[PDB]
RNA sequence: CGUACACGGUGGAUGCCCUGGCAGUCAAGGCGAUGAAGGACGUGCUAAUCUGCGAUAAGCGUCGGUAAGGUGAUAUGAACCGUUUAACCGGCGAUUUCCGAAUGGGGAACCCCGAUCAUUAUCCAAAUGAGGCGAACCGGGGGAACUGAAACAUCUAAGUAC
RNA sequence: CCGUGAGGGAAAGGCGAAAAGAACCCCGGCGAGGGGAGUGAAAAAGAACCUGAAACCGUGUACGUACAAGCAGUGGGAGGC
RNA sequence: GCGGAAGAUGUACGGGGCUAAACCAUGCACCGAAGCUGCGGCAGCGACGUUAUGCGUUGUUGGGUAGGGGAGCGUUCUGUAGCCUGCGAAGGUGUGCUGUGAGGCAUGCUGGAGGUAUCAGAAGUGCGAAUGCUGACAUAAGUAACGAUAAAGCGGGUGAAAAGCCCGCUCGCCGGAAGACCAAGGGUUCCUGUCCAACGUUAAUCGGGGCAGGGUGAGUCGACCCUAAGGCGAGGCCGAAAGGCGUAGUCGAUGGGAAACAGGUUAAUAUUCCUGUACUUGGUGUGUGGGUGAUGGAGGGACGGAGAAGGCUAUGUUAUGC
RNA sequence: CGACACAGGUGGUCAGGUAGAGAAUACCAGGCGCUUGAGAGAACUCGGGUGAAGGAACUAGGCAAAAUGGUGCCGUAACU
RNA sequence: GGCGUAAUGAUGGCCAGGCUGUCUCCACCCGAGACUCAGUGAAAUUGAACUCGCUGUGAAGAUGCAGUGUACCCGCGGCAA
RNA sequence: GCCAUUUAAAGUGGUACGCGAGCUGGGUUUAGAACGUCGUGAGACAGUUCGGUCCCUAUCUGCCGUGGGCGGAGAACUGAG
């Protein structure tokens, strides 16, 4: 009785349309939808932000590759940074060091004194 | 020309109005002429008819007279009793074709 | 050949509509051997269906109402009728072939007669009755089982179904 | 429409103001395949015609693509179109 | 540490490879978890204050199947307030924005008729997962199949097209049989003309296909009539009856059953038409003639089975006869 | 009739048409060609016809196949 | 019901003569096809992905687990793990 | 397994006791029947015996062979493994 509405048929779609990375089906198909997508919301659920302190590896892991040049390395490189001056936080920094033959050494120079 | 009647199958009665579609009635003659396929005549009787009533009536020339608009949809259905399997009875829905073919100057 | 979309098709959902159903309520309420209900088969110039009639066949007559338009649903072609006021609406009357519960007898509609039981009886069927149909309800009789008792022989369903 | 029979038992709605519901011309074996064109209002109308989606088919477009390993994402950095 | 230790299409720790880039006994610094700490955004329980499960602060802070509890939005119709719309709505497609979300909302195209918000009540209310039900559809496949009456072929005709329509010739099939005549049954499907969209497992100017006409003119053909096994109705007799056993009546097999053959004729009919001739029944009567009759019984129809003689038909044949 | 133009099923008469031991093959009469086609000398079966030598050795069993298999004369056992 | 038994019996087992492919082993050919071509044209069947190989492991013989290596596309025919 | 005639030798074990989408079916676990045993009995008895059906046009993958293309083509060769 009750014409089923704006919902079922209205389903099929608001769904499926959001997959801008869709596969073979999973995307032509429903069936394939709510199971492929219901693994979305999950698997990662809340996670992305994996990479932070993920891939991190590098950046505390390159710091003696742009050291280990004009000096010593990680060791005492990181150990002087937060020595003198306003100490610049390791961020956009341990990521330049490798881009670009300068900066890098504007905090070799850094460190290495007042040690 | 146009096209109307037959007892064709519209699914494999096209794909040879397809490389055909493009400009150049000349490059719709040249080709067409081997396709190994039953869609073959049939469809070369129009486009090359096509472009007749083209050049007396309906004013133009055939040096840049090209293909525009072919689209092949149509039936009807009916029923036919084709006898198959070792013995059986079983009604075809066969259905038509429909090959359009425009060669207007472009 | 993978996927998205565009134009066209296939298909038919959906949205809207719907001369239909479903349900409730009020009123009203039997037909027939003066042979009904039902069915069969006819009937309109053409009509294959439906409906109306039925061989005066979607028609005839009277009165009243009504009205110019009319000749059923199909708004076709042909064509007719109406002011000697039709069509249409209501009531009533006339007629109403043959077969047909018909019962004379037989019979898958066809051929010849009051058949059978019973009362009265001038015992001559002569005068009469019964013999059918109809939604449920009602009255008088006959009368289960599965089932329930998470088994079962009382009991229970039943005094119901039939 | 099915069963000897008792009995069983579907599907199919709508163009519209009117009428249109595809005239005329070309092609072709052809009243069975239509360009074109005509019909239109709100018929994104033509004889089961209002609207007309999905599965799906054709053409075409965007983009990969005959070394290529597979859930086909995510974040970071490089490539082009 | 070793002897006791032979078997399967190419053998090694994850590999490279390492005297330690092994292993053993320890130790230190890092990468490496959504771990621990820090910055911007929670839940449940308990405590404090509170009408408060509203806030503020405080302790614990946050994985989950089965299962328990709770919030939520899509939805239809009818309240009360109050709005939008052909300077165009609902719906549909694509897209932008917002919410933790369930969703709301906006734009463009289209649609083109109505459709909402607040508070309130309401509904057969919101759905991918019953060898589920019904309809539709894709891949599979343009894959599988057409076989003792195994016969067609060469020219020609007609046609817009003819390998299977028609003509001639040649080459073959069948003969108790695909020949001839019929029952049952089917049923006009027969014939002619005009066509073919539909039917003919190809095509078709062909058809037992579609449409419109025409055709089956008997006394002696069959029905009609009767009867056998048997059955039915009426009277008689049994709680009752659309229930049963003897008599009178009737019904039940195109079997039984009174009567003609021959010939001719039509595009299609016939011992039914026509020509000639023959025969039966009923009624009446001109004549002859001068008796006209259900039902059971008679011959008759029950002429039954087995063996079989002789006669014998047309035909065929001897005859190369006519 | 069997769902269909399904090699299934379905009564009677014509059993003297011609050649033989017959209502058997070939063939007048009569009827019909209405049981989808075209090209190439595979592997690959079902149907079919028998093999040099041996010969059932196969096999549950000689299943299957084959063999004897007209007529006339001679002749013919056990058993009953 | 025990014993035993002429003729007959598509009954069960066995031996001999003759014969035969039935077997030890097997060539081609004939009719109708297969392979290709015109025309006419269904129905069965699929969760997804999918070209692996060598070892190891695993309920100790999985392509899909683990470690490496490797892998060109399509198509025809077969015997079929 | 009794056994016979030969043989220089004429071993063994695994492959879901390899192998039925390859075959054969002779056996066992059907409708008949016979027999014993059990039962009064029908009937029964992993007791026996006579007769008795075992399917599919493989799509993918794998392998055995044959080709078309891709790295511009015709012809003639070489050739790791």
Do not use: C
């Not at chain 2, 055909?20 to 067409?32: E, H, Y």
Request: net charge positive.
């Amino acid at each position: 009785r009750v014409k089923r509405g704006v919902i079922a048929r209205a389903r099929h779609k608001k769904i499926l349309k959001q997959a801008k990375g869709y596969y073979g089906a999973r995307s032509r198909v429903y069936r394939v939808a709510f199971q492929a997508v219901i693994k979305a919301g999950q698997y990662a659920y809340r996670d992305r932000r994996q990479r932070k302190r993920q891939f991190r590896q590098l950046w505390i892991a390159r710091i003696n590759a742009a050291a280990r040049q004009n000096g010593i390395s990680y060791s005492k490189f990181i150990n002087g940074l937060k020595k003198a001056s306003v100490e610049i936080d390791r961020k956009i920094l341990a990521d330049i060091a490798v881009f670009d033959k300068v900066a890098f050494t504007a905090l070799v120079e850094k460190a290495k004194a007042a040690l | 020309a146009k096209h109307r009647h037959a007892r064709s199958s519209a699914q494999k009665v096209r794909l040879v109005a397809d490389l055909i579609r493009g400009k150049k009635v000349s490059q719709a003659l040249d080709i067409l002429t081997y396709t190994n396929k039953k869609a073959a005549v049939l469809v070369k009787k129009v486009l090359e008819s096509a472009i007749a009533n083209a050049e007396h009536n309906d004013g133009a020339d055939i040096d840049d007279l090209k293909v525009t608009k072919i689209f092949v949809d149509e039936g009807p259905s009916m029923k036919r009793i084709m006898p198959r399997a070792k013995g059986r009875a079983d009604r075809i829905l066969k259905r038509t074709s429909h090959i359009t073919v425009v060669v207007s100057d472009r």
